Amino acid sequence: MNPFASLTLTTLTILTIPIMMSNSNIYKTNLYPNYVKTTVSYAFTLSLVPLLMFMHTGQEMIISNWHWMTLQTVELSLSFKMDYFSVMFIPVALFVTWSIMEFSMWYMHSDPFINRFFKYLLLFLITMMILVTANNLFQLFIGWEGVGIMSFLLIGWWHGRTDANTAALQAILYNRIGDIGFVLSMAWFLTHSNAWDLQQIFMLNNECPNMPLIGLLLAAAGKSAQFGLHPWLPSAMEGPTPVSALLHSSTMVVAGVFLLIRFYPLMETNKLVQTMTLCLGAITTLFTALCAITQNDIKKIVAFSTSSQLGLMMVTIGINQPHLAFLHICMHAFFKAMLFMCSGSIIHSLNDEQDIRKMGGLYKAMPFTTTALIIGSLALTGMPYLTGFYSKDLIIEAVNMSYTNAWALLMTLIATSLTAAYSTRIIFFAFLGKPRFPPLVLINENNPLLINSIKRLLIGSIFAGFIISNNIPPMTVPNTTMPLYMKMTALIVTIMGFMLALELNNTTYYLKFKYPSQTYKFSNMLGYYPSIMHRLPTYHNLSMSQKSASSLLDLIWLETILPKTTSFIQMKMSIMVSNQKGLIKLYFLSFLITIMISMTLFNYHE
Amino acid sequence: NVLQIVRDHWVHILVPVGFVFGCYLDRRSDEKLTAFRNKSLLFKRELRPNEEVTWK
Amino acid sequence: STFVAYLPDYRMQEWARREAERLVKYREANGLPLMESNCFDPNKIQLPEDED
Amino acid sequence: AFSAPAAYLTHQQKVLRLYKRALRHLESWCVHRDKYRYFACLMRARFDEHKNEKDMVKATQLLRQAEEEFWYGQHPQPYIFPESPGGTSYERYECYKVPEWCLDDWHPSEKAMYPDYFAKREQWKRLRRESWEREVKQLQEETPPGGPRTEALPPARKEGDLPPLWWHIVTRPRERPM
Amino acid sequence: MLKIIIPTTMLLPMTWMSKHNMIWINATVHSLLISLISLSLLNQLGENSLNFSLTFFSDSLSAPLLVLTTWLLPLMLMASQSHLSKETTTRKKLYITMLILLQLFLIMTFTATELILFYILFEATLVPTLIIITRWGNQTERLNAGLYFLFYTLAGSLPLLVALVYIQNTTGSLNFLIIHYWSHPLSNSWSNIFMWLACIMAFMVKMPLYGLHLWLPKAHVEAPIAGSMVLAAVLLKLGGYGMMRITTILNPLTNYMAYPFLMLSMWGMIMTSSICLRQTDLKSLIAYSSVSHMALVIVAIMIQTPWSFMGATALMIAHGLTSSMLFCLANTNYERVHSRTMILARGLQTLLPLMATWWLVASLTNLALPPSINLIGELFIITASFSWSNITIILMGMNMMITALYSLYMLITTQRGKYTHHINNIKPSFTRENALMALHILPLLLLTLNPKMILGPLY
Amino acid sequence: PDSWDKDVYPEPPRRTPAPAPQTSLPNPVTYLTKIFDLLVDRPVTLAREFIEQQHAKNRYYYYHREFRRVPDITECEEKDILCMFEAEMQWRRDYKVDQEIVNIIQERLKACQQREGESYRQNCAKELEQFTQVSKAFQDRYSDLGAHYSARKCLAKQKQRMLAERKAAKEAAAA
Amino acid sequence: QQERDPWYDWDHPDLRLNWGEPIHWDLDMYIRNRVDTSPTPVSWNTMCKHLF
Ligand SMILES: CCCCCCCCCCCCCCCCCC(=O)OC[C@H](COP(=O)([O-])OCC(O)COP(=O)([O-])OC[C@@H](COC(=O)CCCCCCCCCCCCCCCCC)OC(=O)CCCCCCCCCCCCCCCCC)OC(=O)CCCCCCCCCCCCCCCCC
Ligand SMILES: CCCCCCCCCCCCCCCCC[C@@H](O)O[C@H](CO[C@H](O)CCCCCCCCCCCCCCC)COP(=O)(O)OCC[N+](C)(C)C
Ligand SMILES: CCCCCCCCCCCCCCCCC[C@@H](O)O[C@H](CO[C@H](O)CCCCCCCCCCCCCCC)COP(=O)(O)OCC[N+](C)(C)C
Ligand SMILES: CCCCCCCC/C=C/CCCCCCCC(=O)OC[C@H](COP(=O)(O)OCCN)OC(=O)CCCCCCC/C=C/CCCCCCCC
Ligand SMILES: CCCCCCCC/C=C\CCCCCCCC(=O)O[C@H](COC(=O)CCCCCCC/C=C/CCCCCCCC)COP(=O)(O)OCCN
Structure with missing residues (x-):
């Protein structure tokens, strides 16, 4: 038999072995995290081979190994899609997870539940693999909800903290808002195409109507945290740094983009949904980039960077470039995970401090972390021939040369400026200048786990772009002829962002004080979206849930109508009937009245 | 030695005996509905040389 | 759970699949349609003679 | 956190609290140490400008104007210590805090391990049981008939007395219990 | 079918002849054996039902309900024996007798071939439940709860009796097979409209339908743990089973007679899900969640599609198991702290980790996480409603969001945060409680591997 | 293989190209394929051979059940319950x-x-x-047909469609 | 409950409540896992204009 299918299924299967051993003795020892990390590394090196087979011959497969149930004409089977997307995304996710678990072995060393933490990470990885490799909509929904629930459990890791529970519930709420659209898409596809599997849907939907595509777009916006449902991703930073590095940076938050990529044959047959996706992506990326440049918490800045990059993935989907979006996902994973890893090392060195205002000169105190963060920032800003170049600059080129909304193009360019802006902010406030942290210096990055993991992701962020770009078939028609000024638009924008952000950052050394402008207040408080949307609708919903639904209806009026009215009427009638004085005079008078009636109203009618 | 344990644990036979009696009564109830045995147009069959009924 | 998993196929799904395979093979081996829009034979149906 | 609050804050206490809040928010605005020091000395000078005011009405009006200025010019994202009520590590270790009475429900096999610790715990329990009645009697003695007026508690005053209501203050789990 | 009924009857003299210290052991062992025997009814023929005799038959709809009842009895016995330890031997035997009589009436109700026998047993289920609630309930409101539970049911059930005898007079039979094979359309007339209402309202109030649901919070909160288990798991499903049996003769009238009930069910599932967000009592939240799930089941039954009936059957089974597990979880904490207020005991995950795991799994099944059977039923019903009308998806999605919201709200309130300081009587979880939670949860997950066992006849 | 009928489940002749290397660099996929063969496909084949050897010693058969053709619901009188039941079973x-x-x-x-x-x-x-x-x-x-479907409702639907088609054809004949 | 003093020695620290004190009618709405009424640096009805 072809080894392709066996290897692809074994890669997914061996990841569940530590979950089965979670009840064994190894889970009670301190060797469990290393065991899980080694298992994930073996899974990565095994998944490398089907990638080579695809890169050689373009081998793609679907495996309907197990039949689950059949409802009339519809068959539901455990089916795996092993096309280019799966065989490319699985090794990248496994590589990032391997690095992040090796990092977690050091970062979470003093946590008394490190074994549970590694088990939760492995469960998230398994659910994400299920989401990615699913061939029908039910399995993809299983992966969807699995990663959602694992995110809920990992955000509220410190369950004694109120804010962590609040953030976890917020993430669940937004994901279910998107899940409404997911369920709508599933129902429409079953009702009109009689299938949930990808192959039948493609065949039967030559001209896809608006309803399923709008449902899928709502689901993607919920999962990828677009402007309507964005705020949960920045608030997900309540979890430990490895959780933010793995789930909410590079692997899970791309699920909506991946869902839209999975349905690109249907998406390219509709222009209204493409326009909606493009506009939503543009507003999301620019709003999040604008919010990022004023934040003082490093994790918040990097989370807003992730949201802006997700918006960029949405805009490159909107211009009908899905393969470019997938390439951007794969490229961005590396350096975004590295950026969170560097931020976590900085936080651990400075006694769990995350505010950049208390981060002084670490350019010399933390040389390796500084080098890694600088390389990641250059990759994020699209420096040529790095990992970010081969995808982001092609995305800008394709956006420039398409029949696209002008406002979306302008907002994409401004977001490209703001990207360099907040990258310069991070570097300037975290690594340059004089120390601003407490005097007792605990800075120490001399641990082989941290160095090895950051080194692996650094080599990735340096060479993966070139290697992957040169080792895949051409799936997009290149833009070969464009004006020179329009070819250099991305670089001009990036240099302008660098220069102006650096100038405004250099001006804070001056011994001059001014009160903030209203635009600064709008940017720092996230456009007041969490200030209003987290207070007004929630208050009104809970107030109506108590005052109207619970009290006014169930406790008062539904009680009044059926049971209380019956009780009152029967009590009144019983009092009327039974309250007789016991005098035979009245009784026999009533008897005479009754006799007179029976002889007249009844005895005359026959 | 078995007298006292029987006297204190004889209650553990009531339910199995009830089960056996229920199966026996189910067979008796089946015995009263043999009006169409080997008479349906779909399952009417020629008896084997030694068998007496198609089902019991 | 073992008993339920190994319950005999009294629901006639494997039988239905085999019957469908036989019918499909017979029907496309002769160029006949795979299914008729009429479930019952029109020749045994006696509609009312006049509709107006 | 440790001190019993008073019925109200004096003008002096409000003035010092406003001074500290203004200094902290100015430090939030002035990231660098030298610029913060310069503007903090300027704030101290402006604050000492009205140090020796005798008219309470004008001092109160100055305090109100200063509070309005602080509210208009406060930092929307002031620096917060990680363990502070607004910090990123405020209640991080609350899930690791287990009350000491849970140790009584341990299995005898669990208490076979750690024998000296449980012997000393028995000593502590005898101490608490032998001090409780004296604590109650002292609290009854030192209390006005119309109930306590503040949340302050008296110390021990006899030879072998312990301060009343001490068990749940002394036996805090920890700040980093695991 | 006698092989199930007769051992259930034998359970009575067996528990009345047992020693004072062996009643729980004997009853649990033989109830588990009876459940094992009843598990053999899942072998269904497909085309038609299993007709054992003139009196009883088994269907693909009846068999999962029968197995659920037989499996629920031992869990009820395990949950009951903790709070009944101080009781006398005679009263404990009477309680077990009530449980056995309820099981017998339930197993006979789901298999009757004729509608008058079904009605007789379906009313006979009232007496043991009423006795349990009003005798072994804890608070003083149990009397009012029992009165509500009795009279809400009877006010709907008596017109059903009148309609059934009238229908037998007009048609000549009420045997379900003859009823189905000789079905004729119901014309558009006032007499037929009132016949439809008399055939429907009893099962409506047993679900319960929103607006007729006020008895359920009272009865489910004020009953002992076993009473709440049987009320939520099984007794709510009598209305759904009756609807599936009775709507065969109601066509084509249901086409427009179902509009007010569909409107009430959708808006009331929204209302009860919202109500769950502001609840100070832990049992009332579970009761209202049951109301919402049964409203969804009512919609599924009303729309009259094969996918709708399949989803309704799956949702009935899944809701029964999940609601029983949630009630047991609440009862454990109530036994610890002797109060039903949700915010009294907080941060129980720090003190009881395995019980916190049980809480998490129950909350996940309550919000219908894939690929659990709860979401199987809910998704099938939602798809059928979408086929009925594309605008139903708004209400379905709103209900899903609110359900996740209050489920995780209950989980966070009861398990997370910091423990209450003054409460110091929270002992480690007993083997009995953990075993009860495991016996609730494991069949739920095992049913995922074989979903066709609970999808019903339309499969 | 030959287990399933190839007419019910057909597929094209499965044309595949021949390898035409263009560089002296060794192909890692071929080496990995040889390693996979020698380490996985041979032990699995041997285990399957032993399993088939054990299966051959115990050979028994199961049969496909054949159902006679009974009269359908169209040729059953209105209140004949037995013919109705058999026709309904056949229809299902x-x-x-x-x-x-x-x-x-x-x-x-x-x-x-x-x-x-x-x-x-x-x-x-x-x-x-x-x-x-x-x-x-x-x-x-x-x-x-909805839930509670039956052969009688299918017959009614067919008759309604036939009446509509006959009316349409008759009205087209006059055009 | 978010507006209450976090430095006070509450009987219930997370809840920020004291034993025996009257409890607000809408406590479960204000548990600080939920609706917050704390004063904002920018006035309400000013943030609304900017957002809209
Ligand atoms: C030939 C083509 C090539 C083009 C090249 C360039 C073209 C021209 C570029 C010029 C454009 C922007 C230039 C910089 C802006 C700010 C500079 C400045 O003056 O600083 C002082 C001041 C900053 O506040 P502050 O009091 O000094 O800060 C307090 C402390 O310093 C707090 O200190 P801190 O420690 O907290 O941190 C300080 C931090 C925080 O600093 C801030 O507070 C700034 C935050 C906001 C300003 C950022 C600019 C981004 C604007 C995007 C808006 C898009 C449209 C949105 C529409 C909104 C509608 C309401 O600063 C930073 O770290 C980085 C900030 C941004 C740096 C990078 C900005 C460059 C990107 C924008 C230009 C794009 C260049 C390429 C063009 C691409 C396409 C051609 O800025 C202002 O007061 C006004 C800012 C202007 C924003 C206008 C928004 C545009 C839309 C307005 C509405 C239009 C409709 C009309 C109304 C509606 C009618 C119905
Ligand atoms: C605590 C520590 C946890 C860590 C340890 C975990 C160890 C691993 C856990 C993961 C195991 C995954 C198992 C995956 C399934 C493998 C087996 C599966 O394929 O069998 C299923 C079998 O499932 C069962 O059939 C269904 C379960 C039946 C449940 C009945 C429960 C008993 C009744 C209890 C009371 C119920 C009350 C409510 C009832 C309504 C499906 O059968 P099917 O693919 O078709 O069979 C094909 C071949 N056949 C047909 C010839 C057999
Ligand atoms: C809190 C929850 C409680 C349970 C809720 C139960 C819901 C019961 C409602 C029943 C649904 C509809 C009943 C009958 C269907 C149509 C009713 C009527 O309004 O329709 C028109 C009927 O016309 C007039 O409206 C007649 C009805 C007017 C008198 C009824 C009084 C309604 C006022 C509301 C009182 C509240 C009732 C519930 C009390 C609790 C249709 O016009 P027409 O085609 O010509 O008549 C069709 C009947 N034919 C064929 C026999 C001729
Ligand atoms: C389409 C159907 C759904 C549409 C949305 C309808 C409105 C939803 C109403 C939900 C009410 C639920 C209330 C119950 C939650 C309990 C209380 C609560 O959650 O507290 C709020 C909690 C705490 O606030 P923080 O600021 O994070 O606190 C941190 C510091 N203390 O935060 C939250 O979770 C509030 C979330 C409210 C979301 C409501 C706004 C959503 C609006 C979405 C519209 C945009 C649609 C997207 C368009 C996409 C393009 C196709
Ligand atoms: C606890 C709350 C539950 C409340 C449920 C109550 C609603 C029950 C439904 C109506 C009950 C009466 C139905 C009567 C039994 C039906 C039998 C039947 O169909 O006979 C009709 C008789 O129809 C009637 O007589 C019905 C008249 C109504 C009598 C009592 C009215 C009380 C109020 C009725 C409306 C409320 C019902 C729904 C409300 C639900 C709860 C709010 C026709 O017979 P013939 O005379 O032979 O006509 C054909 C030949 N000429």
């Missing part, structure tokens, strides 16, 4: 068989879409039209 069996036929056609369509790759829109037109025909027939037969 036919309904299941038709569902399985539609399932087979859907499997063909899915296999074609996966196999044809980038040219599925052109090379799967025959499967698409087959599915369209079977779907129209199955819809006309069984759609809108």
